[PDB]
Design a protein around this motif. Sequence first.
Motif, PDB file in Angstrom:
ATOM      1  N   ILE A  58     -11.651   3.882  -0.243  1.00  0.00           N
ATOM      2  CA  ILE A  58     -12.697   3.043  -0.815  1.00  0.00           C
ATOM      3  C   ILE A  58     -12.212   2.491  -2.149  1.00  0.00           C
ATOM      4  O   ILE A  58     -11.530   3.189  -2.913  1.00  0.00           O
ATOM      5  CB  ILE A  58     -14.012   3.834  -0.981  1.00  0.00           C
ATOM      6  CG1 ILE A  58     -15.092   2.981  -1.652  1.00  0.00           C
ATOM      7  CG2 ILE A  58     -13.774   5.121  -1.756  1.00  0.00           C
ATOM      8  CD1 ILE A  58     -16.437   3.667  -1.740  1.00  0.00           C
TER       9      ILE A  58
ATOM     10  N   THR B  41      -7.198  26.486  18.147  1.00  0.00           N
ATOM     11  CA  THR B  41      -7.969  25.442  17.485  1.00  0.00           C
ATOM     12  C   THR B  41      -7.032  24.358  16.962  1.00  0.00           C
ATOM     13  O   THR B  41      -6.063  24.671  16.253  1.00  0.00           O
ATOM     14  CB  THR B  41      -8.803  26.021  16.332  1.00  0.00           C
ATOM     15  OG1 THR B  41      -9.716  26.998  16.844  1.00  0.00           O
ATOM     16  CG2 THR B  41      -9.584  24.919  15.636  1.00  0.00           C
ATOM     17  N   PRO B  42      -7.268  23.090  17.295  1.00  0.00           N
ATOM     18  CA  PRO B  42      -6.466  22.013  16.695  1.00  0.00           C
ATOM     19  C   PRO B  42      -6.683  21.961  15.192  1.00  0.00           C
ATOM     20  O   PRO B  42      -7.816  21.877  14.712  1.00  0.00           O
ATOM     21  CB  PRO B  42      -6.989  20.750  17.394  1.00  0.00           C
ATOM     22  CG  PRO B  42      -7.651  21.243  18.645  1.00  0.00           C
ATOM     23  CD  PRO B  42      -8.220  22.584  18.297  1.00  0.00           C
TER      24      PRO B  42
ATOM     25  N   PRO C 249     -13.342  -0.969  -5.202  1.00  0.00           N
ATOM     26  CA  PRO C 249     -14.094  -2.192  -5.512  1.00  0.00           C
ATOM     27  C   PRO C 249     -13.233  -3.442  -5.405  1.00  0.00           C
ATOM     28  O   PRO C 249     -12.096  -3.381  -4.925  1.00  0.00           O
ATOM     29  CB  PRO C 249     -14.567  -1.956  -6.951  1.00  0.00           C
ATOM     30  CG  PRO C 249     -13.550  -1.032  -7.526  1.00  0.00           C
ATOM     31  CD  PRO C 249     -13.111  -0.139  -6.398  1.00  0.00           C
TER      32      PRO C 249
ATOM     33  N   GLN D  64      -8.447   0.858  -9.776  1.00  0.00           N
ATOM     34  CA  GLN D  64      -8.665   2.249  -9.409  1.00  0.00           C
ATOM     35  C   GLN D  64      -9.152   2.341  -7.970  1.00  0.00           C
ATOM     36  O   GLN D  64      -9.910   1.488  -7.498  1.00  0.00           O
ATOM     37  CB  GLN D  64      -9.674   2.899 -10.357  1.00  0.00           C
ATOM     38  CG  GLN D  64      -9.782   4.407 -10.210  1.00  0.00           C
ATOM     39  CD  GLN D  64     -10.680   5.030 -11.258  1.00  0.00           C
ATOM     40  OE1 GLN D  64     -11.246   4.333 -12.099  1.00  0.00           O
ATOM     41  NE2 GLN D  64     -10.814   6.351 -11.215  1.00  0.00           N
ATOM     42  N   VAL D  65      -8.714   3.388  -7.271  1.00  0.00           N
ATOM     43  CA  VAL D  65      -8.956   3.526  -5.841  1.00  0.00           C
ATOM     44  C   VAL D  65      -9.253   4.986  -5.526  1.00  0.00           C
ATOM     45  O   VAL D  65      -8.824   5.895  -6.243  1.00  0.00           O
ATOM     46  CB  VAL D  65      -7.749   3.008  -5.024  1.00  0.00           C
ATOM     47  CG1 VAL D  65      -6.601   4.013  -5.047  1.00  0.00           C
ATOM     48  CG2 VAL D  65      -8.158   2.667  -3.611  1.00  0.00           C
ATOM     49  N   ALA D  66     -10.011   5.212  -4.450  1.00  0.00           N
ATOM     50  CA  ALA D  66     -10.347   6.560  -4.015  1.00  0.00           C
ATOM     51  C   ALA D  66     -10.018   6.727  -2.539  1.00  0.00           C
ATOM     52  O   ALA D  66     -10.099   5.774  -1.761  1.00  0.00           O
ATOM     53  CB  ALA D  66     -11.826   6.882  -4.263  1.00  0.00           C
TER      54      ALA D  66
ATOM     55  N   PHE E 192      -7.225  17.387  11.490  1.00  0.00           N
ATOM     56  CA  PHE E 192      -7.004  16.026  11.957  1.00  0.00           C
ATOM     57  C   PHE E 192      -8.341  15.298  11.944  1.00  0.00           C
ATOM     58  O   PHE E 192      -9.353  15.844  12.396  1.00  0.00           O
ATOM     59  CB  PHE E 192      -6.378  16.003  13.359  1.00  0.00           C
ATOM     60  CG  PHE E 192      -7.367  16.192  14.477  1.00  0.00           C
ATOM     61  CD1 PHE E 192      -7.893  17.441  14.752  1.00  0.00           C
ATOM     62  CD2 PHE E 192      -7.765  15.116  15.254  1.00  0.00           C
ATOM     63  CE1 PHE E 192      -8.802  17.616  15.778  1.00  0.00           C
ATOM     64  CE2 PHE E 192      -8.672  15.285  16.284  1.00  0.00           C
ATOM     65  CZ  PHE E 192      -9.192  16.537  16.546  1.00  0.00           C
TER      66      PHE E 192
ATOM     67  N   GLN F 152     -11.767  12.533   6.040  1.00  0.00           N
ATOM     68  CA  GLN F 152     -13.037  12.777   6.709  1.00  0.00           C
ATOM     69  C   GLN F 152     -12.932  13.913   7.717  1.00  0.00           C
ATOM     70  O   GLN F 152     -11.872  14.160   8.299  1.00  0.00           O
ATOM     71  CB  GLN F 152     -13.528  11.510   7.411  1.00  0.00           C
ATOM     72  CG  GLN F 152     -13.748  10.328   6.479  1.00  0.00           C
ATOM     73  CD  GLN F 152     -14.075   9.050   7.227  1.00  0.00           C
ATOM     74  OE1 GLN F 152     -14.063   9.016   8.457  1.00  0.00           O
ATOM     75  NE2 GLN F 152     -14.368   7.989   6.484  1.00  0.00           N
ATOM     76  N   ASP F 153     -14.057  14.612   7.902  1.00  0.00           N
ATOM     77  CA  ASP F 153     -14.230  15.682   8.896  1.00  0.00           C
ATOM     78  C   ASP F 153     -13.097  16.709   8.863  1.00  0.00           C
ATOM     79  O   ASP F 153     -12.846  17.408   9.848  1.00  0.00           O
ATOM     80  CB  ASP F 153     -14.412  15.111  10.309  1.00  0.00           C
ATOM     81  CG  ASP F 153     -13.143  14.495  10.874  1.00  0.00           C
ATOM     82  OD1 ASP F 153     -12.325  15.233  11.460  1.00  0.00           O
ATOM     83  OD2 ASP F 153     -12.970  13.264  10.741  1.00  0.00           O
TER      84      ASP F 153
END
Lengths: 38, 39, 22
Positions: free
Chosen positions: A16, A6-7, A18, A25-27, A10, A31-32
């Motif tokens: 994200i 299984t890879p 404003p 401030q940053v987030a 990745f 993903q996945d």
Amino acid sequence: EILDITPCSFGGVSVITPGTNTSNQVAVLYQDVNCTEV
Amino acid sequence: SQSIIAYTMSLGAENSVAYSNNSIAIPTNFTISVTTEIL
Amino acid sequence: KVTKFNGLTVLPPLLTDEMIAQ
Ligand SMILES: *[C@@H]1O[C@H](CO)[C@@H](O)[C@H](O)[C@H]1NC(C)=O
Ligand SMILES: *[C@@H]1O[C@H](CO)[C@@H](O)[C@H](O)[C@H]1NC(C)=O
Ligand SMILES: *[C@@H]1O[C@H](CO)[C@@H](O)[C@H](O)[C@H]1NC(C)=O
Ligand SMILES: *[C@@H]1O[C@H](CO)[C@@H](O)[C@H](O)[C@H]1NC(C)=O
């Protein structure tokens, strides 16, 4: 014995935030993937 | 004080209706409304 | 009734099937 291949983690990450004159401030969202190895 | 938070998106304010077979809602007042559509 | 590791992935939709059913 049979072994599945299984890879590992990745997936397109993203960030994200404003507007600039609102705050610094940053987030960050990985993903996945489950960021347990981070 | 202010910070970045996350939450499930709302599908609109929940509003139930008092439906019955012997009643009906009829508007007694009204108004005008001008909206914009830019294409 | 209705029926990967090379840099191509799928993104989940913003509105889930439960929200669409609601
Ligand atoms: C950032 O600038 C815009 C444009 O002048 C303004 O409308 C907005 O209120 C500003 N942001 C803050 C946090 O004041
Ligand atoms: C993802 O990792 C967290 C720990 O950071 C764990 O609690 C959770 O069960 C994991 N989810 C999956 C689907 O493996
Ligand atoms: C509305 O339906 C109920 C349910 O069968 C019935 O009992 C009633 O007589 C009907 N009419 C009304 C409430 O005016
Ligand atoms: C209806 O709403 C308007 C809003 O300006 C108000 O002036 C008026 O008295 C209300 N009633 C009627 C019967 O128009």
